[PDB]
Amino acid sequence: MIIANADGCTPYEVARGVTIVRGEGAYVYDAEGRGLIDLSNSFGSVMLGHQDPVVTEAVLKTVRSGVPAAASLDLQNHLAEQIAGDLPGDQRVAFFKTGTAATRAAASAARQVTGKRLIASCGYHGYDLMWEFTPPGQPNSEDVLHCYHLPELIDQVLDKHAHELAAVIIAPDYIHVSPEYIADLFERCERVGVVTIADEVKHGYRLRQGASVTEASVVADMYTYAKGISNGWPLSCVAGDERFLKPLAEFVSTLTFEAPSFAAASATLDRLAELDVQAQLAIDGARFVSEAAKMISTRDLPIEMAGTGAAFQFVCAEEVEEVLLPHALAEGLILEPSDQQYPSACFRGEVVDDALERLDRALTTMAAARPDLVGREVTQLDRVNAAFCQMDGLPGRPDGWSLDQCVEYVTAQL
Amino acid sequence: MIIANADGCTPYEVARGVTIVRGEGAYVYDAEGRGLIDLSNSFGSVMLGHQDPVVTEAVLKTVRSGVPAAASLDLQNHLAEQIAGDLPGDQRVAFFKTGTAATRAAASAARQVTGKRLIASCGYHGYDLMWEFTPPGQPNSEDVLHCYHLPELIDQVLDKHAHELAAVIIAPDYIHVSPEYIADLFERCERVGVVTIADEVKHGYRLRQGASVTEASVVADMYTYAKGISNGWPLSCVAGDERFLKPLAEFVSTLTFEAPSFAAASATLDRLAELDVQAQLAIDGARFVSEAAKMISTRDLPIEMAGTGAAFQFVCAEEVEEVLLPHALAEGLILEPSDQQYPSACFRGEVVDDALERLDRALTTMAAARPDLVGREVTQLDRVNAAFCQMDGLPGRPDGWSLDQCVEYVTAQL
Ligand SMILES: CN[C@@H]1[C@@H](O)[C@@H](O[C@@H]2[C@@H](O)[C@H](O[C@H]3O[C@H]([C@@H](C)O)[C@@H](O)[C@H](O)[C@H]3N)[C@@H](N)C[C@H]2N)OC[C@]1(C)O
Ligand SMILES: CN[C@@H]1[C@@H](O)[C@@H](O[C@@H]2[C@@H](O)[C@H](O[C@H]3O[C@H]([C@@H](C)O)[C@@H](O)[C@H](O)[C@H]3N)[C@@H](N)C[C@H]2N)OC[C@]1(C)O
Ligand SMILES: Cc1ncc(COP(=O)(O)O)c(CN)c1O
Ligand SMILES: Cc1ncc(COP(=O)(O)O)c(CN)c1O
Ligand SMILES: [Cl-]
Ligand SMILES: [Cl-]
Ligand SMILES: [Cl-]
């Protein structure tokens, strides 16, 4: 086709054989009027639900005013205050339009302050070539080294380059590793004096009202947000200590301060607080995951639930996931492949029961269509592969694997 | 304040002492209800006028549908077809959210295809550190060399690095240099086989329905657009030959394909065609500039008009511009400093006469407030300084200047 970039982080791939035309709350609707429970939510950018009435009213009033970009100083500063006030310490906030822009800007700030170039990384930070994964110990074309969330690989990069690193940037994750495991990655870098960036683009405002790493007893020099803050409107930020944010003074685009996205984001943060969204998702998602695990068990299918609350995953072999996903779609349940699911604030009350009923039907048709899968075992390699897709790293060194085997595994995935 | 990035390319700086609350058509309105003719138009991102009724209806319908990101395949492909169809050749289109993202992506594509790193540049391509200006012959921190629109500096970089360059990226401009001058910059690079990027972020869809360089008898391997295509909504693109666009397949963000901006952009391109916008601006802007020059002449003030149509500039010393701009604001006319003005499609009919009447009053109060300025001469250095701010380069080597003097001048501006 003529659109060159319809690949990568594009959501709703399971539904490419149907046509989605409307979204409302927890549901999206196809061209035939069928409602589907949406667990993609634009890859987690929709934290409140589609067409949230308060976000929509704020955007509509802003559009109808016609106020041009960079004129709504009170609103822009207010959103910055909202974001900074949820982080421990004294932060300034620089706004961008995508998560990739925010993470590259955070890295650029660290390079400007330290005068160093090399960056070490765990996780996916966006589409820019600076974030392209290369094997352990091999700097990519923009001088970024990738450590795959392993403390031993962080230790190697620190042993060889601690004096040379502008920063370490870590995307936290908690489905397959603990908060203590994530905190240890940050602390190893802090102890040698390396600037830290907590890449909260995925989890910021999803797991709690602020940065996920705060609850892991971590503080970072800079934090990046995008998905959680704006309910599907294109806004992101770097929030961090003044020393690192001052070099971003001129990091501005013509439409950095277009008003509709600021209105959406400020309303989103207020609504997340008002509806107690992250705490309620912890409860409702836990119920979904526990009941899903029970249904899988009674049907003897080779799937395991991992995680809970706002971030959980159907762990299974690729061959099994390729059956699960179409069977769920046929029952009106949209799941993202090779990733966590992304429930929104609308995944509460009867919506959870509706989703469970649809999953129950999908598991029944799956077992009837593919009886050869009933009784199949989930292997260690299934679990490792599922973790590597979800968190873009290894969930610690798997039991029985040497560090060399970990490096060979990761290299083979690229 | 807590917003770290309120500097740089932020529009409406002349109005930082007043509060703008509404925009409609050619006008914005302050908190006291006063209407001001807007010649910033969000630094030229508003090509149709604030709250264009057709763009607004398309956006509102899209917001009210709640359709999530990446679901409106027909609309996304349609916009790509609209853009590619206005360029000679067979293009594919990769979408981004800001002009800076598009120009960095175009440069990255050239690096991927050629396997080379060094880039040569004329003009401003955005806020990323890769676009930070350094003196002639000094590569910046991301291996970009800056040539300041001078053919002799392009020749030096080609003499030293032609075999090494991934691409040359040129932002065209036509206020202070001719289309033939711009074409020569591209042709010098073509002849030695270097990939060319026409950075049309400012002029694409402003001067004609497509790339400005097309009318200068230029073709480029890639083109970047942003300001002209979306009437203030955050959307940009790289449009170019398949060989260069294929490496951008995975250059995607979660909200690359959020629907409101695509609806705005597709409606904007249709409206620009329907209202014959660029041709009509050529006429109305020419009338404004000619009459403005006449009024300046009768009042004997040290200002010269440069350019015409959709892109013109009040050329004067910084000391004079600092009087002109507040005096124009006091008469309800918003001008951008140290740049061209950016009239929109609403700058037609009686709006042009209204703007001329306001300018006439501002010139009268200026002459009465600052009688010492009456009869002052505009110097060569005034003209060169004005060109350097507007086009981020030299308008050819000024008369009587050596190439060394040009290099020293540019170095002193950084
Ligand atoms: C197979 N090589 C992959 C490479 O393709 C790429 O994978 C990304 C992956 O990281 C992204 O996925 C990542 O980002 C998404 C978010 C963007 O929606 C998160 O939801 C998800 O948890 C995270 N794994 C996915 N969206 C696209 C793949 N091409 O980056 C990591 C990698 C291992 O190098
Ligand atoms: C004084 N050093 C400057 C440096 O500050 C910067 O200048 C930019 C300038 O290029 C931009 O201006 C540029 O981009 C704007 C567009 C973005 O609105 C265009 O309208 C304008 O014609 C163009 N000159 C201006 N918006 C911000 C300055 N800091 O980039 C060029 C430079 C010469 O290195
Ligand atoms: C953790 C993380 N960091 C950064 C990014 C990049 O953000 P974006 O897709 O908005 O460019 C992503 C991908 N969305 C992400 O999940
Ligand atoms: C010619 C040119 N190129 C690229 C850019 C960068 O675009 P943006 O401000 O949208 O990031 C600009 C500045 N807007 C520009 O004028
Ligand atoms: Cl709902
Ligand atoms: Cl009007
Ligand atoms: Cl961006």
Numbering used by the authors:
A (entry chain A), B (entry chain A): 1 to 414
In the authors' words:
Four genes encoding PLP-dependent enzymes (GenB1–GenB4) identified in the gentamicin BGC and a methyltransferase, GenL, from outside the BGC, are responsible for the last steps of gentamicin C complex biosynthesis. Similar to other enzymes from this family, the active site of GenB2 is located in a deep cavity formed by a groove in the interface between the two protomers of the dimer, and each subunit contributes with essential residues for the substrate and cofactor binding.
In order to gather insights into the binding mode of GenB2 substrate gentamicin C2a, we have obtained the structure of GenB2 in complex with gentamicin G418 and gentamicin X2. G418 binds to a groove in GenB2, which is negatively charged and agrees with the complementary charge of a positively charged substrate. Also, several aromatic residues have face-to-face interactions with the sugar rings of the substrate. The ring I interacts via hydrogen bonds with Cys9 and Asp392. As expected, ring II, which is most deeply buried in the GenB2 structure, engages in a large number of direct and indirect interactions. It is possible to observe direct interactions with Lys227, Tyr342, Asp339, Lys202, Cys389, Gln390, and Asp392 and indirect interactions mediated by water molecules with Ser338, Gln340, Gln390, and Lys202.
